[PDB]
Design a protein around this nucleic acid. Structure first.
Length: 849
DNA sequence: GAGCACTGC
């Protein structure tokens, strides 16, 4: 055991802390406690009966509305606005199958519709079912929900379908995503939403009584949400005979979902796309004749294949396939040369280059922008080159979508973001490197890593279609067919990649209390060891008790749309009156940083982050300072100038503001706050006390702790609490800095790439970790009295301070349990405030002097 | 000294 710095507090402070604790100890309506007791006392059969009675609205129909919309449909089908657009819709393959889909839905609870791009299933199926219900005089019984994986798709599809019906958004078609909606009319309507919106609405309507038809789209992508939804339908559907479900998939292991729901009926609907010829590395080199130079394994892969194709290609072409760097993106000049090849030959059209990540995008951009080869210098001024990455601004401007100036060919250098998330319509040419990056978690070492990997066959098939939107395209794959043969069908289903705390907790509000039993019923069952890791984390933050039963705190956290650790932090910031900085930190961790990282500007970005961090040694407080400065720029009508100078996305900043406001409104509704405004002065009295903000941030990121031992940019010797050496990620505001006031840090995420990095950190003080943490005990190790935290970090502490801190923790636990069971704002002059004051006083001792 | 991509009444 190694003893750390002395945490003893002065007698004058100890005296006041004990006065404040004893004032707190002299303390003597709750509808939340009755709801929590009721949830725990009902079995699943009762839960089902009670939710039926509470969501009965769809038991009510409106015969005059039914008659009126039937009449209006028949009439307006003779108007000349529709009946053009109806003849155009009938060109969509899905409309050929309308009557068979109507009949199959009528005869089956679940059907599956399988189709590729252009088939029209997403826009036409909801309309077919809606117009049939209206035609049959059933209109007001029809409420159709169609889930989408992505926000932008929910909006765009809803707007398109609304236009096809000659309606403004909000009549028969609507959309709902998080914090934005254009709601359709209540009945005889189609709503497009993100899958997560529907999952959240299950808390109020767990058996889905409030819709007649559920359409799950893009299930072949195997997001957590749709995988979970399908598992929940196995619980729900036996209790909902009248509910209809239409599953929708691209043709990517479509049979999995058919098998998963008994053997349900499956429609295969043909696509509409222009042909895209597929070339592989052998064909590419046979065209360009590019010459390379500056385990194997690989040799066992390529040599049998070179035998099979020996007569179809020149031997010098085949011989290049034996070079391991011929495949993938390992040689960027090879890729640049293929770009030049397409620029010289082939018809006009844009080039879309799929590369794994930021680093290789930067390399290809620099080669094309500042070429060393004469062939490149000829082409430099004839290309319009756009790097595309989730951290770069290019996707948030218009230029990459519009056609380039005449005589210039657009070249887009992209990550997987342009596979689905981002769409460029004038692309005729795709260079598919076959490489992406993936995050991998190793259960046994508890290490998350980011590794360059081969893409899957489904990825290659998706990238190929990206060349066929306008005219016949070409897809150049930078690997051999032998490499393709070795690729997996699909990416690992993301639920096998996921941390499970939030899911397990949310299931409790649906009365699925045994997560081992339910998650085993998914299409791919997560590792039971990851479920246990999820349950143990939830017991550690006391969202579950030691029996695994939901606590009052756990119920509150399940009702916030954020990971429970950060939900806890937000709730603590309400009690400790730091709401605004803490919701900023939580929202940035839950969503993302507002900072861009544009090509070549990375040291400039580092300097901006430094200035926003204001020497507070926290990436989390840095984000909040950014938000404070962003508000000032709006108040100054300097918003654009501010975002430009500081490399900030105003779109991300505005979304972070919306999320902070959602957290504030929910806490207000749950009676933890007197005001719903996250800036409200009452909720923020402590928001400029930095040691208090470090304490609350620590309370949320605990137990992820690190300890720095080191001197010198500076070199760092630092280890997380598990003993593994780490460094701050270079993008972090603590990388390379020296002179930390404290050697301790908390962090949200640790990740291995070239080193084991902390991607974000806040410098913290021991006494804060001790007050809000666990594994706390006082004792004597050598002859020195100590106080420890997590049974890991042992601090010199005298008896007087130890006994007061241990007593403080007991009262804090008592206060937290009571606020969770009986939510109410902490009154300024009351008993509970005196315990808050005791803690503020102890934490203020670490203020920067 | 480095950052695949989604998302929440």
């Amino acid at each position: 055991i190694r003893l750390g710095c002395n945490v003893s507090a002065p007698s004058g402070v100890l005296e006041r802390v004990k006065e404040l604790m004893e004032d707190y100890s002299r303390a003597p309506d709750a509808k939340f406690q009755q709801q929590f007791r009721h949830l725990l006392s009902v079995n699943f059969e009762e839960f089902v009966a009670e939710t039926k009675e509470r969501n009965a609205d769809l038991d009510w129909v409106n015969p005059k509305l039914d008659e009126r919309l039937q009449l209006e449909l028949g009439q307006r089908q003779l108007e000349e606005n529709a009946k053009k657009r109806l003849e155009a819709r009938k060109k969509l393959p899905t409309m050929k199958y309308a009557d068979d889909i109507i009949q199959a839905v009528r005869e089956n609870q679940v059907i599956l519709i399988v189709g590729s791009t252009g088939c029209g299933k997403t826009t036409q199926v909801p309309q077919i079912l809606l117009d049939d219900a209206i035609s049959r005089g059933c209109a007001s019984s029809c409420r159709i929900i169609c889930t989408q994986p992505r926000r932008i798709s929910a909006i765009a599809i809803a707007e398109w379908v609304s236009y096809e019906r000659c309606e403004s958004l909000g009549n028969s078609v609507g959309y709902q995503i998080r914090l934005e909606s254009r709601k359709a009319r209540e009945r005889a309507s189609i709503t497009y939403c993100t899958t997560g919106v529907l999952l959240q609405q299950l808390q109020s309507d767990p058996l889905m009584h409030n819709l007649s038809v559920l359409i799950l789209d893009e299930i072949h992508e195997r997001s957590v949400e749709t995988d979970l939804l399908m598992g929940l339908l196995k619980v729900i559907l036996p209790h909902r005979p009248d509910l209809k479900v239409i599953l929708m998939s691209a043709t990517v292991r479509e049979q999995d979902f058919c098998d998963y729901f008994n053997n349900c009926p499956m429609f295969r609907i043909e696509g509409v796309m222009f042909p895209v010829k597929m070339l592989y590395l052998e064909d590419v080199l046979s065209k360009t004749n590019y010459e390379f130079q500056k385990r194997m394994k690989h040799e066992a892969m390529i040599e049998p294949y070179l035998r099979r194709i020996r007569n179809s290609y020149d031997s010098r072409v085949l011989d290049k396939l034996r070079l391991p760097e011929s495949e993938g993106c390992e040689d960027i000049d090879f890729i640049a040369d293929l770009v030049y090849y397409i620029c010289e030959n082939e018809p006009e059209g844009a080039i879309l280059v799929f590369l794994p990540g930021y680093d290789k995008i930067s390399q290809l951009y620099n080669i094309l922008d500042k070429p060393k080869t004469s062939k490149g210098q000829r082409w430099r001024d004839h290309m319009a080159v756009f790097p595309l990455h989730s951290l770069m601004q290019s996707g948030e401007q218009q230029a990459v979508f519009r056609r380039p100036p005449a005589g210039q060919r657009k070249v887009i250098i992209s990550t997987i973001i342009a596979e689905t998330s981002v769409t460029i319509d004038d692309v005729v040419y795709v260079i598919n490197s076959g490489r992406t990056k993936a995050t991998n978690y190793d259960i046994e070492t508890n290490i998350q890593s980011l590794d360059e990997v081969w893409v899957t066959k489904a990825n290659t098939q998706q990238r190929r279609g990206r060349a066929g939107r306008v005219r016949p395209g070409i897809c150049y794959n930078l690997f051999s067919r032998a490499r393709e043969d070795r690729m997996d069908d699909i990416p690992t289903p993301e639920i096998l990649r996921s941390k499970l705390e939030s899911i397990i907790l949310s299931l409790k509000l649906l009365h699925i209390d045994d997560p081992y039993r339910f998650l085993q019923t998914l299409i791919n069952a997560p590792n039971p060891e990851a479920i246990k890791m999820g349950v143990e984390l939830l017991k550690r933050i006391e969202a579950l008790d030691q029996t695994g039963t939901l606590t009052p705190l756990g119920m509150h956290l399940a009702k916030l749309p954020i990971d429970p650790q950060m939900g806890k932090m937000i709730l603590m910031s309400a009690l400790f009156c730091c709401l605004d900085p803490i919701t900023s930190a939580a929202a940035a961790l839950s969503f993302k940083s507002p900072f861009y990282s544009p090509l070549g500007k990375e040291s400039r970005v580092d300097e901006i982050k430094r200035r926003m961090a204001r020497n507070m040694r926290s990436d989390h407080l840095m984000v909040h300072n950014t938000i404070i400065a962003y508000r000032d720029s709006r108040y100054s009508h300097a918003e654009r100038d501010f975002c430009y100078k500081n490399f900030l996305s105003s779109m991300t900043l505005q979304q972070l503001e919306r999320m902070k406001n959602q957290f504030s409104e929910l806490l207000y509704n749950y009676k933890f706050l007197a005001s719903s405004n996250c800036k409200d002065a009452a909720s923020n009295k402590n928001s400029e006390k930095i040691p208090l903000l470090r304490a609350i941030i620590g309370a949320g990121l605990y137990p992820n702790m690190a300890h720095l031992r080191k001197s010198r940019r500076a070199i760092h010797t630092m280890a997380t609490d598990d003993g593994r050496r780490v460094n701050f990620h270079p993008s972090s505001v603590n990388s390379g800095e020296s002179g930390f006031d404290s050697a301790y840090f908390v962090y949200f995420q640790r990740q291995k790439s070239t080193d084991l990095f902390l991607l974000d950190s806040t410098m913290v003080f021991p006494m804060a970790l001790i007050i809000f943490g666990d594994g706390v005990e006082a004792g004597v190790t050598q002859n020195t009295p100590y106080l420890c935290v997590a049974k890991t970090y042992y601090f010199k502490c005298n008896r007087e301070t130890a006994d007061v801190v241990i007593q403080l923790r007991s009262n804090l636990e008592k206060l937290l349990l009571k606020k969770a069971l009986y939510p109410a704002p902490i009154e300024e002059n009351g008993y509970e405030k005196q315990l808050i004051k005791a803690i503020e006083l102890l934490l203020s001792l670490d203020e920067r002097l």
